[PDB]
Amino acid sequence: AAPVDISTLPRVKVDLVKPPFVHAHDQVAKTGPRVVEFTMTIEEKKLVIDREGTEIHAMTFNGSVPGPLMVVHENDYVELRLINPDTNTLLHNIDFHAATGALGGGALTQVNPGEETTLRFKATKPGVFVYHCAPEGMVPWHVTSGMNGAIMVLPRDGLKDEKGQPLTYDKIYYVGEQDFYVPKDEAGNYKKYETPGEAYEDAVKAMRTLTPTHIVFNGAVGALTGDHALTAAVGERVLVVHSQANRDTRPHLIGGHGDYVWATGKFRNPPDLDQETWLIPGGTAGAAFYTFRQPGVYAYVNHNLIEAFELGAAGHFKVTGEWNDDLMTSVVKPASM
Amino acid sequence: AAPVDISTLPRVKVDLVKPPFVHAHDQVAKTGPRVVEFTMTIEEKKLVIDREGTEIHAMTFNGSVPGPLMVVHENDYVELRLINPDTNTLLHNIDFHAATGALGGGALTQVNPGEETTLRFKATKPGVFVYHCAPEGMVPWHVTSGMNGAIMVLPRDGLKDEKGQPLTYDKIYYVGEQDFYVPKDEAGNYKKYETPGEAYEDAVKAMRTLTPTHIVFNGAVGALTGDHALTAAVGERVLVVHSQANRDTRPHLIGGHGDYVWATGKFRNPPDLDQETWLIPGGTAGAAFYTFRQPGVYAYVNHNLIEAFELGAAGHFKVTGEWNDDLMTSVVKPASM
Amino acid sequence: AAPVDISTLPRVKVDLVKPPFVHAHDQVAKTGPRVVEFTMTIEEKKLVIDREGTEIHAMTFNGSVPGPLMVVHENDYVELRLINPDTNTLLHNIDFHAATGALGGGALTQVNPGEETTLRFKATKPGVFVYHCAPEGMVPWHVTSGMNGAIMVLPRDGLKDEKGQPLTYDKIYYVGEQDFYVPKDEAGNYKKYETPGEAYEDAVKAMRTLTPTHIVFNGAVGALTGDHALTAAVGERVLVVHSQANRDTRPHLIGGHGDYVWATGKFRNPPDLDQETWLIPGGTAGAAFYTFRQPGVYAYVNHNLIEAFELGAAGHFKVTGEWNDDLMTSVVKPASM
Ligand SMILES: O=N[O-]
Ligand SMILES: O=N[O-]
Ligand SMILES: O=N[O-]
Ligand SMILES: [Cu+2]
Ligand SMILES: [Cu+2]
Ligand SMILES: [Cu+2]
Ligand SMILES: [Cu+2]
Ligand SMILES: [Cu+2]
Ligand SMILES: [Cu+2]
């Protein structure tokens, strides 16, 4: 039996958006299988990651930490043009956990500054998956410099609950959680470096402590707060895709739940119901579906609360609508007696 | 459609017990939905947490670390009177992971010393859940000072196995596992502090190491041993609820199993069978059901064995009854030859 | 009702093999229940664990880290003769997480140098399980010196998928992952020690940091690479059993998946499908089944990539067969433009 002639399939070009937003897509596939075309441009850039002003040299897909969320359906082909402009200094590549073969693509996509490449793979398994740079011999340095994102491979008939009934989200957000290892001197202050090569050994030393200096959502402390808080309305169904390319996390919606959670991200499995908190292992993307029931502020965190509130792994939702006093009320407001 | 008039519902007052014991309750609900009334009094107090005599300033619900286990059924209302006496010095509140809205209750329950408040919420999801103090801006300090416990929301028809058959426990225990971060000087000795404000920065520094100094059950090294070992008889069905409000744990019954385990604690999901060890993520309560088959001593641990046997995360069961040589026997006792 | 007379049952002697290989066995039981006889000889020995030449004093079952994989079926009896030769210096024992009673066997198997013992237990629960030494008062020291392995208790009708259909592996490998805590001086160099007693306090100090110095597969950095890479052919079904007796891990096949994964190792549960990465809690064995679809090199890692590529937790597969360009292809090889 001969393979399909891939040139006979539809091609659709996706235009990516910056996290936590997600490029519009259809949950249930409205066409047959397609070759879904993506382009990303690698950008090495300085980023300020905390309120103190700590500035690092980040390594990004498309200018953001995390890289953007890509969305396809099961048995589509993903065709990525990966560009490493000559304004960068390092070698990069890309590994898709969604893909099969060649170290997820990394063995086929090594691009020096001034080079580009195009990789195609068939997205044979539904789920959310990490993608990340992984140059042989310097893999964790690139990943923990921010060079990771995620791809969602939807079932062609959309998401389903534990009984096989549909689950349809109204909104989707992508939270990439990044552990950074900013090198410290003996007194505990961050060091700064003149070139990437001069940074490398202390970057390795800092990583080998296994103790992040910062753990952030969307690339910085506070990034998903204030004017950039996530939003929803009461009654809205929201999917939050959450990735961590290098270290475990334990997401939690403060004031809510994960009504349906694929903690390790793979949609052929029935979701776990009614979660308070769930474990997304390092190297994984997970997804949680929730229908909001109360308005107000929520905090969405890694529930190692030190990691959340001291190291950065906390964002907010601002939710609009009516308050339900049956679900919760202050019977007696705080008072002296 | 109008809401139910909650004043028409039965009220029942619960009288809490100190962990690891659990206030008597009925597994299968013997009434319709009720407003279940609880009272807890916050107590800041010194606690000796290890064999060396290390003394910390703990922040407790009801005088214990962990706070007591509360038990209700799905779609009961929990009505908690939370009292912060004027003998305390700090601001406190309470967040229930079982609840929906207002940061689990924390936004509605801020009490200064000399204040009290009453919160009501509907327990809409079955499972075991963490509760903890969470004052904005100093959340992990309160949690990791011991200010956390758990609530069990039973299905109205009790627990069920993976096939839908009942599971009925004979005994229940609540193991709260606490990570403490006692500040250390450069030589490695614990520091002591004159006031909570003078402690705060080094408490933050110590937490940011992400390395607990102590990890204990029921508030101290050895608390669940000796005259306070857990007990059972051969053939008894025991549910062990285990919470960790801030850091992952991996419980294990040495010499036994978790016959049915809800590792992330939520009873609408079928349990995992025959577990040796299970991962309870930080910010979660889990529950394990076991039928004892052999007498003797067991050790119940976090199976990072350093955490268990060096840092404190180990308790014991003393089990009474007949020894089964079919299940295990010494064929040849240790000997020279 | 009287117990079975165990002397009426067949006895079969197993001859163990060194990891990552596994002693031949039948997936589906070809006999009724048997007493399966194993012998292991404890060996304390020096091991070089990294490329730098760091040499530790390891504590082994049968000369290897990990100890060999034992394989039986559900409701067989395991009868282990455990020998501690007089050439060793320490007390040892064995705890099987598969067993019920007497701290998994440890209370019955304490052997001084020059002693042996024989333990029997009934393997009543199917799954992969850790076994490890656990001498009272010095448990984590022995475990983290390498004194751990695993046992697989197969269902009598072999493995099944989430729908109850058979899963049959063609190849099985056992990856034991070991966290070592080599004591460091203040400058960060490893210390060496003249006797085990002189090592003990700093071993304890090093363990209490909770920061491994090395995390390795099969006892050393690079052990499962080069001439000792794992092998498969395209189309082959491979089961990888993975244990970690003391600390969480998150395995990942780089370029592949876990098609069916029992992350916490217990076969009465349906497997998780299509995993990218899975969490094996410390104190647990897990198992992943994969059918290879592409040839070439794969890296099998703990996907804390620092742990993998800096601390040692990485091995390789070399896979033989045809490349499938439908599944993945380089459309445009890296080039300037
Ligand atoms: O109650 N959430 O931190
Ligand atoms: O065998 N339990 O540590
Ligand atoms: O893409 N695996 O590191
Ligand atoms: Cu890169
Ligand atoms: Cu990866
Ligand atoms: Cu408090
Ligand atoms: Cu919380
Ligand atoms: Cu030993
Ligand atoms: Cu153990």
mmCIF file with all atom_site columns, C-alpha atoms in Angstrom, chain A residues 116-267:
data_model
loop_
_atom_site.group_PDB
_atom_site.id
_atom_site.type_symbol
_atom_site.label_atom_id
_atom_site.label_alt_id
_atom_site.label_comp_id
_atom_site.label_asym_id
_atom_site.label_entity_id
_atom_site.label_seq_id
_atom_site.pdbx_PDB_ins_code
_atom_site.Cartn_x
_atom_site.Cartn_y
_atom_site.Cartn_z
_atom_site.occupancy
_atom_site.B_iso_or_equiv
_atom_site.pdbx_formal_charge
_atom_site.auth_seq_id
_atom_site.auth_comp_id
_atom_site.auth_asym_id
_atom_site.auth_atom_id
_atom_site.pdbx_PDB_model_num
ATOM 1   C CA . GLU A 1 116 ? 15.979  28.501 8.017  1.00 0.00 ? 116 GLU A CA 1
ATOM 2   C CA . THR A 1 117 ? 14.407  25.069 7.662  1.00 0.00 ? 117 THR A CA 1
ATOM 3   C CA . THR A 1 118 ? 10.988  23.529 7.069  1.00 0.00 ? 118 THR A CA 1
ATOM 4   C CA . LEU A 1 119 ? 9.886   20.411 9.004  1.00 0.00 ? 119 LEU A CA 1
ATOM 5   C CA . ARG A 1 120 ? 6.677   18.428 8.452  1.00 0.00 ? 120 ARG A CA 1
ATOM 6   C CA . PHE A 1 121 ? 5.217   15.842 10.797 1.00 0.00 ? 121 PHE A CA 1
ATOM 7   C CA . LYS A 1 122 ? 1.901   14.047 11.129 1.00 0.00 ? 122 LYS A CA 1
ATOM 8   C CA . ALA A 1 123 ? 0.096   14.848 14.383 1.00 0.00 ? 123 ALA A CA 1
ATOM 9   C CA . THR A 1 124 ? -0.991  11.279 15.088 1.00 0.00 ? 124 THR A CA 1
ATOM 10  C CA . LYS A 1 125 ? -1.975  11.624 18.778 1.00 0.00 ? 125 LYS A CA 1
ATOM 11  C CA . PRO A 1 126 ? -4.520  14.039 20.288 1.00 0.00 ? 126 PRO A CA 1
ATOM 12  C CA . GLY A 1 127 ? -3.549  16.138 23.261 1.00 0.00 ? 127 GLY A CA 1
ATOM 13  C CA . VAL A 1 128 ? -1.639  19.207 24.325 1.00 0.00 ? 128 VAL A CA 1
ATOM 14  C CA . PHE A 1 129 ? 2.128   18.717 24.009 1.00 0.00 ? 129 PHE A CA 1
ATOM 15  C CA . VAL A 1 130 ? 5.299   20.659 24.760 1.00 0.00 ? 130 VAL A CA 1
ATOM 16  C CA . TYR A 1 131 ? 7.603   21.850 22.027 1.00 0.00 ? 131 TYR A CA 1
ATOM 17  C CA . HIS A 1 132 ? 11.072  23.178 22.798 1.00 0.00 ? 132 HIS A CA 1
ATOM 18  C CA . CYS A 1 133 ? 14.522  23.886 21.432 1.00 0.00 ? 133 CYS A CA 1
ATOM 19  C CA . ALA A 1 134 ? 17.038  21.125 22.172 1.00 0.00 ? 134 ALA A CA 1
ATOM 20  C CA . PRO A 1 135 ? 20.511  21.589 20.623 1.00 0.00 ? 135 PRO A CA 1
ATOM 21  C CA . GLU A 1 136 ? 22.673  18.566 21.443 1.00 0.00 ? 136 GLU A CA 1
ATOM 22  C CA . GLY A 1 137 ? 24.911  19.325 24.391 1.00 0.00 ? 137 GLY A CA 1
ATOM 23  C CA . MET A 1 138 ? 23.147  22.474 25.562 1.00 0.00 ? 138 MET A CA 1
ATOM 24  C CA . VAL A 1 139 ? 19.514  21.355 25.864 1.00 0.00 ? 139 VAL A CA 1
ATOM 25  C CA . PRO A 1 140 ? 18.469  22.548 29.342 1.00 0.00 ? 140 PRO A CA 1
ATOM 26  C CA . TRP A 1 141 ? 20.190  25.919 28.834 1.00 0.00 ? 141 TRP A CA 1
ATOM 27  C CA . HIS A 1 142 ? 17.968  26.701 25.846 1.00 0.00 ? 142 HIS A CA 1
ATOM 28  C CA . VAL A 1 143 ? 14.780  25.363 27.447 1.00 0.00 ? 143 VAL A CA 1
ATOM 29  C CA . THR A 1 144 ? 15.329  27.247 30.706 1.00 0.00 ? 144 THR A CA 1
ATOM 30  C CA . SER A 1 145 ? 16.145  30.424 28.775 1.00 0.00 ? 145 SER A CA 1
ATOM 31  C CA . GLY A 1 146 ? 12.504  30.416 27.653 1.00 0.00 ? 146 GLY A CA 1
ATOM 32  C CA . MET A 1 147 ? 12.754  28.458 24.382 1.00 0.00 ? 147 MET A CA 1
ATOM 33  C CA . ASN A 1 148 ? 9.615   26.353 24.713 1.00 0.00 ? 148 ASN A CA 1
ATOM 34  C CA . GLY A 1 149 ? 5.889   26.477 23.952 1.00 0.00 ? 149 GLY A CA 1
ATOM 35  C CA . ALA A 1 150 ? 3.090   24.013 23.252 1.00 0.00 ? 150 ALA A CA 1
ATOM 36  C CA . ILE A 1 151 ? 0.935   22.534 20.497 1.00 0.00 ? 151 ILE A CA 1
ATOM 37  C CA . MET A 1 152 ? -2.651  21.344 20.851 1.00 0.00 ? 152 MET A CA 1
ATOM 38  C CA . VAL A 1 153 ? -3.759  18.449 18.669 1.00 0.00 ? 153 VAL A CA 1
ATOM 39  C CA . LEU A 1 154 ? -7.543  18.343 19.027 1.00 0.00 ? 154 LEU A CA 1
ATOM 40  C CA . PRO A 1 155 ? -9.545  15.189 18.351 1.00 0.00 ? 155 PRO A CA 1
ATOM 41  C CA . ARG A 1 156 ? -11.353 15.699 15.066 1.00 0.00 ? 156 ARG A CA 1
ATOM 42  C CA . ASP A 1 157 ? -14.675 15.556 16.932 1.00 0.00 ? 157 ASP A CA 1
ATOM 43  C CA . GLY A 1 158 ? -13.550 17.950 19.663 1.00 0.00 ? 158 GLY A CA 1
ATOM 44  C CA . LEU A 1 159 ? -13.229 17.317 23.372 1.00 0.00 ? 159 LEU A CA 1
ATOM 45  C CA . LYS A 1 160 ? -15.294 14.807 25.349 1.00 0.00 ? 160 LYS A CA 1
ATOM 46  C CA . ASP A 1 161 ? -16.053 14.232 29.016 1.00 0.00 ? 161 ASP A CA 1
ATOM 47  C CA . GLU A 1 162 ? -15.621 11.026 30.968 1.00 0.00 ? 162 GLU A CA 1
ATOM 48  C CA . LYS A 1 163 ? -18.913 9.686  29.591 1.00 0.00 ? 163 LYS A CA 1
ATOM 49  C CA . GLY A 1 164 ? -18.268 10.498 25.954 1.00 0.00 ? 164 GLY A CA 1
ATOM 50  C CA . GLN A 1 165 ? -20.460 13.635 25.865 1.00 0.00 ? 165 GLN A CA 1
ATOM 51  C CA . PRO A 1 166 ? -19.035 16.786 24.252 1.00 0.00 ? 166 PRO A CA 1
ATOM 52  C CA . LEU A 1 167 ? -17.158 19.445 26.119 1.00 0.00 ? 167 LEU A CA 1
ATOM 53  C CA . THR A 1 168 ? -17.014 22.750 24.230 1.00 0.00 ? 168 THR A CA 1
ATOM 54  C CA . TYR A 1 169 ? -14.983 25.688 25.496 1.00 0.00 ? 169 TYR A CA 1
ATOM 55  C CA . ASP A 1 170 ? -16.019 29.286 24.936 1.00 0.00 ? 170 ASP A CA 1
ATOM 56  C CA . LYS A 1 171 ? -12.510 30.720 25.665 1.00 0.00 ? 171 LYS A CA 1
ATOM 57  C CA . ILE A 1 172 ? -9.027  29.201 25.674 1.00 0.00 ? 172 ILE A CA 1
ATOM 58  C CA . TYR A 1 173 ? -5.868  30.525 27.263 1.00 0.00 ? 173 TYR A CA 1
ATOM 59  C CA . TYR A 1 174 ? -2.315  29.221 27.189 1.00 0.00 ? 174 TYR A CA 1
ATOM 60  C CA . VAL A 1 175 ? -0.234  29.603 30.360 1.00 0.00 ? 175 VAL A CA 1
ATOM 61  C CA . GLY A 1 176 ? 3.416   28.735 29.838 1.00 0.00 ? 176 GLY A CA 1
ATOM 62  C CA . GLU A 1 177 ? 5.262   28.394 33.122 1.00 0.00 ? 177 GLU A CA 1
ATOM 63  C CA . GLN A 1 178 ? 9.010   29.052 33.024 1.00 0.00 ? 178 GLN A CA 1
ATOM 64  C CA . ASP A 1 179 ? 11.633  28.123 35.599 1.00 0.00 ? 179 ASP A CA 1
ATOM 65  C CA . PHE A 1 180 ? 14.650  30.415 35.294 1.00 0.00 ? 180 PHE A CA 1
ATOM 66  C CA . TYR A 1 181 ? 18.037  29.782 36.950 1.00 0.00 ? 181 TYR A CA 1
ATOM 67  C CA . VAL A 1 182 ? 19.698  33.210 37.092 1.00 0.00 ? 182 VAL A CA 1
ATOM 68  C CA . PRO A 1 183 ? 23.261  32.669 38.332 1.00 0.00 ? 183 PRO A CA 1
ATOM 69  C CA . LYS A 1 184 ? 23.962  34.013 41.849 1.00 0.00 ? 184 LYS A CA 1
ATOM 70  C CA . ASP A 1 185 ? 27.148  35.078 43.485 1.00 0.00 ? 185 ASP A CA 1
ATOM 71  C CA . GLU A 1 186 ? 28.019  33.861 46.964 1.00 0.00 ? 186 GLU A CA 1
ATOM 72  C CA . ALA A 1 187 ? 26.170  36.827 48.582 1.00 0.00 ? 187 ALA A CA 1
ATOM 73  C CA . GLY A 1 188 ? 23.051  35.836 46.621 1.00 0.00 ? 188 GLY A CA 1
ATOM 74  C CA . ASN A 1 189 ? 22.921  38.524 43.918 1.00 0.00 ? 189 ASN A CA 1
ATOM 75  C CA . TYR A 1 190 ? 22.330  37.815 40.329 1.00 0.00 ? 190 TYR A CA 1
ATOM 76  C CA . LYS A 1 191 ? 25.237  37.876 38.009 1.00 0.00 ? 191 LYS A CA 1
ATOM 77  C CA . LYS A 1 192 ? 25.062  39.423 34.564 1.00 0.00 ? 192 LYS A CA 1
ATOM 78  C CA . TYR A 1 193 ? 27.245  38.283 31.552 1.00 0.00 ? 193 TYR A CA 1
ATOM 79  C CA . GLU A 1 194 ? 28.896  39.906 28.576 1.00 0.00 ? 194 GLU A CA 1
ATOM 80  C CA . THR A 1 195 ? 28.375  37.044 26.043 1.00 0.00 ? 195 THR A CA 1
ATOM 81  C CA . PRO A 1 196 ? 26.439  33.772 25.964 1.00 0.00 ? 196 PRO A CA 1
ATOM 82  C CA . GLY A 1 197 ? 29.668  31.757 26.032 1.00 0.00 ? 197 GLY A CA 1
ATOM 83  C CA . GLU A 1 198 ? 30.903  33.624 29.149 1.00 0.00 ? 198 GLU A CA 1
ATOM 84  C CA . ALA A 1 199 ? 27.527  32.876 30.768 1.00 0.00 ? 199 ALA A CA 1
ATOM 85  C CA . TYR A 1 200 ? 27.421  29.199 29.958 1.00 0.00 ? 200 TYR A CA 1
ATOM 86  C CA . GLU A 1 201 ? 29.357  27.601 32.841 1.00 0.00 ? 201 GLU A CA 1
ATOM 87  C CA . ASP A 1 202 ? 27.658  29.561 35.569 1.00 0.00 ? 202 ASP A CA 1
ATOM 88  C CA . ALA A 1 203 ? 24.295  28.933 33.754 1.00 0.00 ? 203 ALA A CA 1
ATOM 89  C CA . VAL A 1 204 ? 25.134  25.236 34.079 1.00 0.00 ? 204 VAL A CA 1
ATOM 90  C CA . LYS A 1 205 ? 26.180  25.696 37.724 1.00 0.00 ? 205 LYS A CA 1
ATOM 91  C CA . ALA A 1 206 ? 22.943  27.546 38.476 1.00 0.00 ? 206 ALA A CA 1
ATOM 92  C CA . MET A 1 207 ? 20.836  24.882 36.764 1.00 0.00 ? 207 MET A CA 1
ATOM 93  C CA . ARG A 1 208 ? 22.622  22.094 38.688 1.00 0.00 ? 208 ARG A CA 1
ATOM 94  C CA . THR A 1 209 ? 21.395  23.575 41.975 1.00 0.00 ? 209 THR A CA 1
ATOM 95  C CA . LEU A 1 210 ? 17.914  22.441 40.820 1.00 0.00 ? 210 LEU A CA 1
ATOM 96  C CA . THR A 1 211 ? 16.557  25.591 42.537 1.00 0.00 ? 211 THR A CA 1
ATOM 97  C CA . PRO A 1 212 ? 14.859  28.111 40.241 1.00 0.00 ? 212 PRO A CA 1
ATOM 98  C CA . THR A 1 213 ? 15.417  31.768 41.002 1.00 0.00 ? 213 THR A CA 1
ATOM 99  C CA . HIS A 1 214 ? 12.164  32.685 39.266 1.00 0.00 ? 214 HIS A CA 1
ATOM 100 C CA . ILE A 1 215 ? 9.099   30.692 38.197 1.00 0.00 ? 215 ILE A CA 1
ATOM 101 C CA . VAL A 1 216 ? 6.827   32.838 36.034 1.00 0.00 ? 216 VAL A CA 1
ATOM 102 C CA . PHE A 1 217 ? 3.779   32.743 33.787 1.00 0.00 ? 217 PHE A CA 1
ATOM 103 C CA . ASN A 1 218 ? 3.969   34.402 30.372 1.00 0.00 ? 218 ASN A CA 1
ATOM 104 C CA . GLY A 1 219 ? 7.592   35.393 30.832 1.00 0.00 ? 219 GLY A CA 1
ATOM 105 C CA . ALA A 1 220 ? 7.628   37.678 33.894 1.00 0.00 ? 220 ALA A CA 1
ATOM 106 C CA . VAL A 1 221 ? 6.380   38.206 37.428 1.00 0.00 ? 221 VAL A CA 1
ATOM 107 C CA . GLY A 1 222 ? 2.928   39.739 37.186 1.00 0.00 ? 222 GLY A CA 1
ATOM 108 C CA . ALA A 1 223 ? 2.606   39.226 33.435 1.00 0.00 ? 223 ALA A CA 1
ATOM 109 C CA . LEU A 1 224 ? -0.959  37.846 33.730 1.00 0.00 ? 224 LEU A CA 1
ATOM 110 C CA . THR A 1 225 ? -2.184  40.544 36.120 1.00 0.00 ? 225 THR A CA 1
ATOM 111 C CA . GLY A 1 226 ? -3.501  44.122 35.927 1.00 0.00 ? 226 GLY A CA 1
ATOM 112 C CA . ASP A 1 227 ? -4.231  45.192 32.391 1.00 0.00 ? 227 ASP A CA 1
ATOM 113 C CA . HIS A 1 228 ? -3.180  41.725 31.296 1.00 0.00 ? 228 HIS A CA 1
ATOM 114 C CA . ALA A 1 229 ? -5.303  39.666 33.696 1.00 0.00 ? 229 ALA A CA 1
ATOM 115 C CA . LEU A 1 230 ? -7.200  36.814 32.052 1.00 0.00 ? 230 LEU A CA 1
ATOM 116 C CA . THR A 1 231 ? -10.938 37.448 31.724 1.00 0.00 ? 231 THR A CA 1
ATOM 117 C CA . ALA A 1 232 ? -14.183 35.495 31.718 1.00 0.00 ? 232 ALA A CA 1
ATOM 118 C CA . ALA A 1 233 ? -17.869 35.913 32.418 1.00 0.00 ? 233 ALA A CA 1
ATOM 119 C CA . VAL A 1 234 ? -19.988 33.883 34.814 1.00 0.00 ? 234 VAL A CA 1
ATOM 120 C CA . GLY A 1 235 ? -21.238 30.844 32.923 1.00 0.00 ? 235 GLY A CA 1
ATOM 121 C CA . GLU A 1 236 ? -18.421 30.840 30.415 1.00 0.00 ? 236 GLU A CA 1
ATOM 122 C CA . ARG A 1 237 ? -16.558 27.561 29.736 1.00 0.00 ? 237 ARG A CA 1
ATOM 123 C CA . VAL A 1 238 ? -12.790 28.155 29.734 1.00 0.00 ? 238 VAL A CA 1
ATOM 124 C CA . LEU A 1 239 ? -9.956  25.810 28.783 1.00 0.00 ? 239 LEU A CA 1
ATOM 125 C CA . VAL A 1 240 ? -6.590  26.668 30.327 1.00 0.00 ? 240 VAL A CA 1
ATOM 126 C CA . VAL A 1 241 ? -3.697  24.886 28.643 1.00 0.00 ? 241 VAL A CA 1
ATOM 127 C CA . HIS A 1 242 ? -0.643  24.921 30.936 1.00 0.00 ? 242 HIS A CA 1
ATOM 128 C CA . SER A 1 243 ? 2.856   23.761 30.009 1.00 0.00 ? 243 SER A CA 1
ATOM 129 C CA . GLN A 1 244 ? 6.108   23.276 31.890 1.00 0.00 ? 244 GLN A CA 1
ATOM 130 C CA . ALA A 1 245 ? 8.955   22.029 29.691 1.00 0.00 ? 245 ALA A CA 1
ATOM 131 C CA . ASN A 1 246 ? 11.447  21.301 32.484 1.00 0.00 ? 246 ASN A CA 1
ATOM 132 C CA . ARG A 1 247 ? 9.929   21.024 35.993 1.00 0.00 ? 247 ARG A CA 1
ATOM 133 C CA . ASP A 1 248 ? 6.773   19.800 37.682 1.00 0.00 ? 248 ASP A CA 1
ATOM 134 C CA . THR A 1 249 ? 3.982   22.233 38.438 1.00 0.00 ? 249 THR A CA 1
ATOM 135 C CA . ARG A 1 250 ? 0.684   21.939 40.318 1.00 0.00 ? 250 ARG A CA 1
ATOM 136 C CA . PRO A 1 251 ? -1.879  24.391 38.911 1.00 0.00 ? 251 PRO A CA 1
ATOM 137 C CA . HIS A 1 252 ? -4.817  25.625 40.941 1.00 0.00 ? 252 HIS A CA 1
ATOM 138 C CA . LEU A 1 253 ? -7.573  28.171 40.280 1.00 0.00 ? 253 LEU A CA 1
ATOM 139 C CA . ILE A 1 254 ? -8.022  29.988 43.599 1.00 0.00 ? 254 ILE A CA 1
ATOM 140 C CA . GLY A 1 255 ? -11.781 30.212 44.130 1.00 0.00 ? 255 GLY A CA 1
ATOM 141 C CA . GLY A 1 256 ? -12.524 27.645 41.435 1.00 0.00 ? 256 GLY A CA 1
ATOM 142 C CA . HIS A 1 257 ? -11.683 24.120 40.279 1.00 0.00 ? 257 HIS A CA 1
ATOM 143 C CA . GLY A 1 258 ? -10.668 22.119 37.243 1.00 0.00 ? 258 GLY A CA 1
ATOM 144 C CA . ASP A 1 259 ? -14.073 20.670 36.391 1.00 0.00 ? 259 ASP A CA 1
ATOM 145 C CA . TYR A 1 260 ? -12.458 18.362 33.808 1.00 0.00 ? 260 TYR A CA 1
ATOM 146 C CA . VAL A 1 261 ? -8.665  18.031 33.800 1.00 0.00 ? 261 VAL A CA 1
ATOM 147 C CA . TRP A 1 262 ? -6.259  16.139 31.548 1.00 0.00 ? 262 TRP A CA 1
ATOM 148 C CA . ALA A 1 263 ? -3.342  16.624 33.933 1.00 0.00 ? 263 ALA A CA 1
ATOM 149 C CA . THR A 1 264 ? -0.867  14.944 31.589 1.00 0.00 ? 264 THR A CA 1
ATOM 150 C CA . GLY A 1 265 ? -2.659  16.425 28.593 1.00 0.00 ? 265 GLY A CA 1
ATOM 151 C CA . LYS A 1 266 ? -3.805  13.539 26.371 1.00 0.00 ? 266 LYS A CA 1
ATOM 152 C CA . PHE A 1 267 ? -7.397  13.606 25.171 1.00 0.00 ? 267 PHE A CA 1
#
